[PDB]
Design a protein around this nucleic acid. Structure first.
Length: 88
RNA sequence: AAA
C-alpha cells in the first residue's frame, strides 16, 4: 500500500493547498471555526474514494504529511488554519 | 465534486 499511500497523500495535500483553498468554498464552508474537517468527509471526495475506501490507509497517508495536522477524527491545514473557515 |  506504500505507493497508494503516496497518491492519497499528494491528493489530500492538494485539497489543503493555498491554490485550492482560495477557490474551494465547499470545503471551507464545511470547516469548523478552527479549520478542522472530518477525515471521513475527505475520504468521500471522488479522487480519494477512487483510490481507496480504506480509512486506515487514508489516516496513514496523512500522518506522513507536513501540510496537514490530524487531531482524532479531524484534519486541518497546519499553517494558519483559522483564516479559511466560511459560514455553512 | 482535483468538492
Amino acid at each position: 500500500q506504500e505507493l497508494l499511500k503516496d497518491y492519497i497523500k499528494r491528493q489530500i495535500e492538494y485539497y489543503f493547498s493555498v491554490d485550492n483553498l482560495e477557490r474551494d468554498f465547499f470545503l471551507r464552508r464545511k470547516m469548523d471555526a478552527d479549520g478542522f474537517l472530518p477525515i471521513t468527509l475527505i475520504a468521500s471526495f471522488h479522487r480519494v474514494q477512487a483510490l481507496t475506501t480504506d480509512i486506515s490507509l487514508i489516516f496513514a497517508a496523512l500522518k506522513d504529511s507536513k501540510v496537514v495536522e490530524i487531531v482524532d477524527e479531524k484534519v486541518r491545514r497546519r499553517e494558519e488554519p483559522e483564516k479559511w473557515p466560511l459560514p455553512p
